[PDB]
Chains A and B, each alone.
With several copies, the nearest count.
Chain A
Amino acid sequence: RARFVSKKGNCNVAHKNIREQGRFLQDVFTTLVDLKWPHTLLIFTMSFLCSWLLFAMAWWLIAFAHGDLAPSEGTAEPCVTSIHSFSSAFLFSIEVQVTIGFGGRMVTEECPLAILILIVQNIVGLMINAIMLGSIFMKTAQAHRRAETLIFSKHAVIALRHGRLCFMLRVGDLRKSMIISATIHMQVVRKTTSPEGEVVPLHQVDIPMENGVGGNSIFLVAPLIIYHVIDANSPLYDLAPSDLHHHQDLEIIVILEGVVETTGITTQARTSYLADEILWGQRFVPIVAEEDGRYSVDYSKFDNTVKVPTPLCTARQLDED
């Protein structure tokens, strides 16, 4: 009825009634990176423009304190030359802080407070330059956009394999760059009761991916079939083919995560498979073929299932001969 993880990868959780809002202000950097793109563009150009405006008001108060804006002059040199407006001091603070430095307006050595506010504007401009260009590079360089190009299967399947019944989905990679140390964590989620009376509303039970050693690692070049074998330890052991309908609380989330080879920053791709989206008795078509010295992968045949003769009873009842 209401799903946990959406099929592109967003988790549908609300996070209501959060008591301590004061611990969000003890990390300003993860909140600064985790904003949306018009918010990070507004805090980018508003932080740069408010630093230029604050130091432009400082240079305007320096030239007002020396009397430089009042043009009744004799021969005394101003401590910034050729300021006679606010907007000249705004062009001077723009020329100082991002280090353009034209030379119609330069600092002479009269006011020592001008040399102090030049040192302070260069130090706060180097801090704002380092933190903001590193923050926009960490914003555009983060690895959550690698989950858009990791195409999963649309439907997962449960089929016969090697005497057992195996829960199969199909992952796929799209790029010539690989993904280093890709792991798989398949979790079931359902509203479980305990035998002793505990009710967990989303009890996340990890099921093993069958691999050969038991450990969860894959080599993702070809679109391979991730398969989980249903033994008696696995919580899909009493699943009926008539149980796989809508309004059935059974959901398998598949979490694929690894280090992207190009960036070096670890990604996570995730999906879900609800109880109507699991096809019983079908299996995936082989899509990999050997041609002209290479291996063809046909991505148009990705979710295509062929029907298998399959026993229509539960996996506990396949242990009854």
Chain B
Amino acid sequence: PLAFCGSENHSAAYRVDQGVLNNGCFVDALNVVPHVFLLFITFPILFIGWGSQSSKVHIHHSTWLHFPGHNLRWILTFMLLFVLVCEIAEGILSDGVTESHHLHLYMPAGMAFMAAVTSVVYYHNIETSNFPKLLIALLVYWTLAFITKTIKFVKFLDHAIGFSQLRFCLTGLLVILYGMLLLVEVNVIRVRRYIFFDLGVRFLQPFVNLLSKGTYWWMNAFIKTAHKKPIDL
């Protein structure tokens, strides 16, 4: 039937007679809402701005500007992806112990995972087009995700679930990871202050994003166009 937190209980666990946000299903349904906010603020502006760059309006390939904190932003985003796939597998092992698909264990972490991939490709599409006049929607996503994770963490600390059950440790890692993904305060205040405060080199390795430093995504163009062309000096 697949409901949020099951029909398996005496009749339902949906009742809120203790209050709002004492229900674990309600604090996980509140944990959904910045990820669905970032998906429906990110997918039309990415499909308008960078799905329009088809053939016969190609790209610029020079002056990759690199808004700072860039290496630690991608290192923290890959640590966020690792702790989110641990929350997927922890919610799957929490779900399989009874029955009936208690859906609130892994559906907010899956929506957080898809919001994290669209956040990092939204940051890369901002950062290769070199204008910072966006990205405050990403900032209010990180503050919304931080306040919903710290309300989940303080309601985990209320019932004494501390450090033996692993969803306390994973929400504590995600609270300190969203607090270190409030690194966009360096981009608005400390460096470059947008809110209120090269040449014909075609090598492109030391000025590219850190995934393309890792898996060499710029070399896909050179391995593409060495077909149907010989490579001269």
Contacts and interface: CB of A to CB of B under 8 A. Distances in A.
Interface of A: 13-22, 24-25, 28, 31-32, 34-35, 39, 43, 46-47, 50-51, 54, 57, 60-61, 64-65, 67, 69-72, 85-86, 174-176, 300
Nearest to B229: A292
27 contacts: A16-B58, A17-B59, A17-B60, A17-B62, A18-B57, A19-B60, A20-B130, A21-B131, A24-B49, A24-B52, A25-B131, A39-B51, A46-B43, A47-B44, A57-B33, A61-B30, A61-B33, A64-B16, A65-B16, A65-B26, A67-B15, A67-B16, A69-B14, A70-B11, A71-B12, A85-B3, A300-B62
Given A22-B133, A24-B49, A300-B60, 11 more contacts: A15-B58, A17-B59, A17-B61, A18-B59, A25-B45, A25-B49, A31-B48, A31-B52, A71-B12, A72-B12, A86-B3
A15 B57 contact: yes
B32 interface: yes
Contacts of A70: 11-12, 14-16
Given A69-B12, A70-B14, A72-B12, A176 B57 contact: yes
Interface in B27-59: 29-30, 32-33, 36, 40, 43-45, 47-53, 56-59
Which of A54, A70, A175 has its CB near the most chain B CB atoms (within 10 A)? Answer: A70
Interface in B174-231: none
Contacts of A54: 36, 40
A28 B48 contact: yes
Contact of A64 (B14, B36, B45, B60): B14
Interface string B4-32: 10000001101111001000011001101
A54 to B, nearest CB: 5
Nearest to B134: A25
B118 interface: no
Contacts of A64: 14, 16, 25-26, 29
Given A54-B36, A70-B15, A72-B12, A14 B58 contact: yes
A13 B56 contact: yes
A61 B29 contact: yes
Interface of B: 3-4, 11-12, 14-17, 20, 25-26, 29-30, 32-33, 36, 40, 43-45, 47-53, 56-62, 129-131, 133
Contacts of A17: 58-62
B40 A43 contact: no
B22 to A, nearest CB: 12
B55 to A, nearest CB: 9
Contacts of A175: 57
Contacts of A15: 56-58
Contacts of A51: 40
Contacts of B50: 21
Contacts of B47: 43
A63 to B, nearest CB: 10
B36 to A, nearest CB: 6
Which of B49, B51, B53, B56 has its CB near the most chain A CB atoms (within 10 A)? Answer: B56
B60 A72 contact: no
Nearest to A28: B48
Contacts of B130: 20
A43 B44 contact: yes
For the complex of A and B, 9 pairs with smallest distance between CB atoms? A70-B14, A70-B15, A21-B129, A22-B131, A67-B16, A69-B14, A15-B57, A70-B12, A25-B49
Given A22-B129, A43-B47, A67 B57 contact: no
B51 to A, nearest CB: 7
Contacts of B11: 70-72
A65 to B, nearest CB: 6
Contacts of A25: 45, 48-49, 131
B201 to A, nearest CB: 13
B15 to A, nearest CB: 4
Given A15-B56, A17-B60, A25-B49, A65 B40 contact: no
Contacts of B58: 14-18
Contacts of A13: 56
A94 to B, nearest CB: 17
A21 B36 contact: no
A154 to B, nearest CB: 17
B141 to A, nearest CB: 15
A72 B29 contact: no
A248 to B, nearest CB: 26
B26 A32 contact: no
Contacts of A20: 129-131
B12 A57 contact: no
Contacts of B60: 17-19, 300
